């Protein structure tokens, strides 16, 4: 997908303003709490019986760091996303056996967390641009399934 120069400048500015530690942890914790069946893959991380424990789990943040790093790399390489999201796509298709709905669910949760952190600076144009970005990343990462 193509983006206008103004949209590119806006998304680059906000991403530069993003704190790169707690956003991924918040996204993962909110996903696990809101959609409970997603714990079938993360049950190896320890206690997840209550949202307090889910948010306080250290492995949740330790994995959200890698998730947000992957998102940052994908955002850095927007022109070629299929080439960048190849090994991850193969891993998800082969070992994890995850249907592609969870990818868009995680993207929506990330957009919600971004809006929560940035407040009124999340204008509708920037929200649309980030929706396009997350849709592109999800489609690139889930391609072998269909």
């Amino acid at each position: 997908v193509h983006l206008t120069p103004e949209e590119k400048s806006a998304v680059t500015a906000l991403w530069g303003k993003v704190n790169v530690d707690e956003v991924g942890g918040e996204a993962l914790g909110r996903l696990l709490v809101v959609y409970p069946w997603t714990q079938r893959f993360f049950e190896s991380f320890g206690d997840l019986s209550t949202p307090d424990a889910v948010m306080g789990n250290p492995k949740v943040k330790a994995h959200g760091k890698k998730v947000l790093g992957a998102f940052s790399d994908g955002l850095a390489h927007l022109d070629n996303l299929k080439g960048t999201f190849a090994t991850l796509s193969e891993l998800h298709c082969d070992k994890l056996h995850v249907d592609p709905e969870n990818f868009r669910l995680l993207g929506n949760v990330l957009v919600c967390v971004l809006a929560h952190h940035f407040g009124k600076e999340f204008t509708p144009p920037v929200q649309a641009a980030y929706q396009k970005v997350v849709a592109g990343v999800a489609n690139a990462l889930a391609h072998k399934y269909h």
């Binding site: 914790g29 909110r30 709490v33 809101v34 949202p51 948010m55 929506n108 957009v111 919600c112 809006a115 929560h116 407040g119 009124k120 999340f122 509708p124 144009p125 929200q127 649309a128 929706q131």
Partner: protein
Amino acid sequence: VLSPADKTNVKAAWGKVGAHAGEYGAEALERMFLSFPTTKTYFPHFDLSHGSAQVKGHGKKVADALTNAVAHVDDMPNALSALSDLHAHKLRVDPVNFKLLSHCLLVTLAAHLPAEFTPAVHASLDKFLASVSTVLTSKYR
């Protein structure tokens, strides 16, 4: 369907929302229209600019309907039978767009209410909006 904890959380969240319902609904409509342009084909007689009087009025009507649904959370079909009939027989809208509207509403109430948008409130609002959309998308009687 809904747990008492979820019902209490939804009631508290909407009570905190209060009288900003019209502006929140108008903002949700604008967000949906900008984000997804494939849902602009249901409004062919509107002027979908920024700060439109008709869009503001429709947002206020949607907000009032949502407030009534909150006030009658346990009686959704009896409260919204007319809306269900209008949305299912006349307009004939597929149930995909309700997900987009619910997500846009969630973003709108998250942006302006950072204190009350805890994970529990997030889950309660998600389930409540899903139930409202499910009730509204039906063909009965």
